[PDB]
């Protein structure tokens, strides 16, 4: 069911990243790949029930 | 199947312990069948036995041909 | 002790059991009677009339 | 392959602690760390 | 590279505020940036403070921090000096552990002694000064052995079973001094260390020679001793021995095994920083050959 | 900074004429001092007729190496090298050197006089100068000695005696060495008896316990490089407190053996003096 | 030669495995006979078999004296 969630969301795991890349997450590190063309600049949003 | 299959895993362990000792032309023709050879188990349902012993025939029987270099 | 099997002088070790196994000059008999007086004293017992 | 063809890696990094440099080497050379087990699976002769 | 580091304060010093820092002259001070004029907010281990209350993560983040010896309190600045490789400078004791001449020293994260002297010795609006311990090498690595045995022990146990060994494991003893150790338990960094640890244990178990692994049993009937009686109990689970093999194979079967003996022990190993020479009679200052 | 020694024993001119040949030497000093007795010089203060090898290096590991410089009246003017600077260290002589060699210190094991051994005795006292050897020769001689501690337990086999006969002859550039047998008088050395248990104990405990810890990491997945290793762990085939103490019994044997493994370099060869009478080297350690 | 050649090495291995278990006053003289006790094997040549056996008799018979400590 979790694979169906990642598929329906469209956000597939990048092989759970490198294990050292997970080790750097506790210090904080970028996860998003940079978008290619970005004429509109930085994007942001948030969500609340 | 109790007393019969009780020695089946024993003979399969004998095929494995004898099987590691003998070099082949390459492990890539054997390492997958050697992995299934030791990963064998027995599902609780009797109907899954067709999936059990037949996989050992896919493996160890070819290893005897690999001992003789049969085509 | 050096017990002798035939054509042998083999070593042997026999543990002591009783406290009276100790030879006199290490546990002389007056010392045993004196300790016996201590046993008759501390244990609270007297011979029958 | 049967004939090893070792690679060579000059590299610069701000890291200065060998205990962490081997740790970042652990997950990056997963094919190589698998290869060290991959010789034992085939050829017990000749030590990896 | 730079031979020295400087710092700037926010909240102003008093008599005691500068006196506690003059007390810390010639003492270890980690830095993470090595800029010529670091801010006090980046100074110290306090920047890695963690509400999850870890410890091993503080150690791994400590692994990359540069060490810099303290010197000269001009006032309103730390005036750190960057140690040079291969020489010596005096170093004050910090960690509550007795020192001896010639022992190796290493950096370890602090932990409360038990009674807890709780001497922060410096504080501002919230920021503090947490100086990592300088401890003798066998003590520096045995705690890593405790955290590693704590990691392997955690698997498949009831919580009372999980904490049963901990009553002995977290209460380490050394030179009369005793220490209780709060632990991350599971902080991923212990897990990734466990993966290379068991991977080393596998090859060390597998690279062993057929006679080398049998050597204890070959000695078992050969001799009788209480250390061997303690040796005997571990190996058995519930007399014959064989001998073969050509001599040349052992030079290979043993050689690669030495690399695993390093790779297995490397994780409990720590880089040395100090080597004491002239111990002070008052048990405070100690000059040390070799630095970071 | 210079370190001094004193000879309370009288110096015959024949002995000081050998001592002047030691313009430099890697003389150990147990404790750095402004002044020190000659009884503290060398490994001779640690000499044992029993333990032999390993203990000589486990006590040598903490020694403070120092070069010789000049000699005066009944006193030595030792000078401690600074790290990284070049120094004209003398060889101990067993092995000819060539450019670029690594160097490290080893306990002495004489086989007659070495190429640079002018004997110097001052009433029972003797000076045993530590080896300066290329690193690969040190790792190989350590492997031969630990192997000698394995096979010596069962000398009687002719294949084993021929095995020791084969491994006894280490070789190098025109070298002709013969490895001393640590196990004099048949009985094993206590150092060999401990160093062999330091490895063979782990050789059993790792073989028994490796399955349970790979087991929990097998169901977890990542690169899954670890999961495949257990299939070859099976090729050679339950208490709580036993599981507790047993790991504490593991690393205690693993750890002291690391000193037998790792060997920090102390010098590196560059230009070589003719007939290897001396060599400049970069000090390290 | 069937059962005679078969059970002889089995009893010889049994005398060996039982023989290492018992401590003696010295491992010196015993170790050579303990080595010959294991090294014996059945060569294909027929006339050499007596030397395969009698040399083992030089071992275990002295070991039997060492079981009683004699001369």
UniProtKB/Swiss-Prot annotation, chains B, G:
It is found in: Virion tegument; Host cytoplasm; Host nucleus. It comes from the Viruses. Phosphorylated by host CCNA2. Participates in the last steps of viral maturation and release. Associates with nuclear capsids prior to DNA encapsidation and later preserves the integrity of nucleocapsids through secondary envelopment at the assembly compartment. Interacts with host CCNA2 and thereby blocks the onset of lytic gene expression to promote establishment of a quiescent state of infection in undifferentiated cells. Interacts with host BICD1 and RAB6A. Interacts with small capsid protein UL48A; this interaction links together the capsid and pp150. Interacts with host CCNA2. Belongs to the herpesviridae large structural phosphoprotein family. This is Large structural phosphoprotein. It comes from Human cytomegalovirus (strain AD169) (HHV-5).
Swiss-Prot record, chain C:
It is found in: Virion; Host nucleus. It comes from the Viruses. Homomultimer. Makes the hexons and eleven out of twelve pentons. Interacts with triplex proteins 1/TRX1 and 2/TRX2; adjacent capsomers are linked together in groups of three by triplexes, heterotrimeric complexes composed of one molecule of TRX1 and two molecules of TRX2. Interacts with scaffold protein; this interaction allows efficient MCP transport to the host nucleus. Interacts with capsid vertex component 2/CVC2. Interacts with the small capsomere-interacting protein/SCP. Belongs to the herpesviridae major capsid protein family. Self-assembles to form an icosahedral capsid with a T=16 symmetry, about 200 nm in diameter, and consisting of 150 hexons and 12 pentons (total of 162 capsomers). Hexons form the edges and faces of the capsid and are each composed of six MCP molecules. In contrast, one penton is found at each of the 12 vertices. Eleven of the pentons are MCP pentamers, while the last vertex is occupied by the portal complex. This is Major capsid protein. It comes from Human cytomegalovirus (strain AD169) (HHV-5).
From Swiss-Prot, chain E:
The keyword Membrane does not apply. Keywords: Capsid protein, Host nucleus, Virion. The keyword Chloroplast does not apply. One of its GO terms (cellular component) is viral capsid. Coiled coil: none annotated. It is found in: Virion; Host nucleus. Its main location: virion. Disulfide bonds: none annotated. One of its GO terms (molecular function) is structural molecule activity. Interacts with TRX1 and major capisd protein/MCP. Belongs to the herpesviridae TRX2 protein family. Structural component of the T=16 icosahedral capsid. The capsid is composed of pentamers and hexamers of major capsid protein/MCP, which are linked together by heterotrimers called triplexes. These triplexes are formed by a single molecule of triplex protein 1/TRX1 and two copies of triplex protein 2/TRX2. Additionally, TRX1 is required for efficient transport of TRX2 to the nucleus, which is the site of capsid assembly. This is Triplex capsid protein 2.
From Swiss-Prot, chain F:
Structural component of the T=16 icosahedral capsid. The capsid is composed of pentamers and hexamers of major capsid protein/MCP, which are linked together by heterotrimers called triplexes. These triplexes are formed by a single molecule of triplex protein 1/TRX1 and two copies of triplex protein 2/TRX2. Additionally, TRX1 is required for efficient transport of TRX2 to the nucleus, which is the site of capsid assembly. Disulfide bonds: none annotated. Interacts with TRX1 and major capisd protein/MCP. Keywords: Capsid protein, Host nucleus, Virion. One of its GO terms (molecular function) is structural molecule activity. The gene is TRX2. This is Triplex capsid protein 2. Belongs to the herpesviridae TRX2 protein family. Its main location: virion. The lineage of its organism: Viruses, Duplodnaviria, Heunggongvirae, Peploviricota, Herviviricetes. One of its GO terms (cellular component) is viral capsid. It is found in: Virion; Host nucleus. It comes from Human cytomegalovirus (strain AD169).
């Amino acid at each position: 069911v979790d694979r169906w969630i990642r598929h329906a969301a469209g956000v597939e795991r990048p092989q759970l990243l490198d294990t050292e890349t997970i080790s750097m997450l506790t210090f904080g590190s970028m996860s998003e790949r940079n978008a290619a063309a970005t004429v509109h600049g930085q994007k942001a949003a948030c969500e609340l029930i | 199947l109790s007393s019969v299959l009780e020695e089946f895993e024993v003979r399969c362990v004998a095929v494995a312990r004898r099987g590691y000792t003998y070099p082949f032309g390459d492990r890539g023709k054997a390492r997958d069948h050697l992995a299934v050879l030791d990963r064998t188990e027995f599902d609780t349902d009797v109907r899954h036995d067709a999936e059990i012993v037949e996989r050992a025939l896919v493996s160890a029987v070819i290893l005897a041909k690999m001992s003789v270099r049969e085509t | 002790t050096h017990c002798q099997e035939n054509s042998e002088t083999v070593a042997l070790c026999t543990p002591r059991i009783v406290i009276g196994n100790l030879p006199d000059g290490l546990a002389p008999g007056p010392f045993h009677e004196l300790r016996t007086w201590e046993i008759m004293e501390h244990m609270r017992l007297r011979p029958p009339p | 392959g049967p004939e090893t063809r070792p690679g060579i890696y000059v590299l610069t990094s701000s890291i200065a602690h060998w205990q962490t440099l081997v740790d970042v080497a652990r997950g990056k050379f997963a094919r190589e760390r698998c290869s060290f087990v991959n010789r034992r699976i085939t050829r017990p002769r000749q030590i990896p | 590279m730079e031979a020295n580091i400087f710092c700037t304060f926010d909240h102003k010093l008093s008599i005691a505020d500068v006196g506690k820092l003059t007390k810390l002259v010639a003492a270890v001070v980690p830095i993470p940036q090595r800029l010529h004029l670091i801010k006090h907010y980046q100074l110290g281990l306090h920047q890695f403070v963690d509400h999850t209350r870890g410890y091993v993560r503080l150690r791994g983040l400590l692994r990359n921090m540069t060490l810099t010896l303290m010197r000269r309190v001009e006032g309103n600045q730390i005036l750190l000096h960057v140690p040079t490789h291969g020489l010596l400078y005096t170093v004050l004791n910090t960690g509550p552990v007795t020192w001896e001449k010639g022992d190796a020293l290493c950096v370890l994260p602090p932990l409360f002694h038990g009674p807890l002297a709780r001497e922060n010795l410096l504080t501002l609006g919230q920021w503090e000064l947490v100086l990592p311990w300088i401890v003798p090498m066998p003590l520096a690595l045995e705690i890593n052995q405790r955290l590693l045995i704590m990691g392997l022990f955690s698997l498949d146990r009831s919580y009372e079973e999980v904490k049963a060994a901990v009553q002995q494991l977290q209460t380490i003893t050394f030179r009369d001094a005793t220490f209780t150790i709060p632990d991350p338990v599971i902080d991923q960094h212990l897990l990734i260390d466990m993966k290379t640890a068991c991977l080393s244990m596998s090859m060390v178990a597998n690279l062993a020679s057929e006679l080398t692994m049998t050597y204890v049993r070959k000695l078992a009937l050969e001799d009788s001793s209480m250390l061997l009686v303690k040796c005997q109990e571990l190996l058995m689970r519930l007399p014959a021995r064989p001998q073969h093999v050509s001599p040349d194979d052992e030079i290979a079967r043993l050689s690669a095994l030495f690399v695993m003996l390093r790779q297995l022990d490397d994780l409990i190993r720590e880089q040395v920083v100090f080597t004491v020479c002239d111990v002070s009679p008052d048990n405070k200052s100690a000059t040390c050959i070799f630095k970071g």
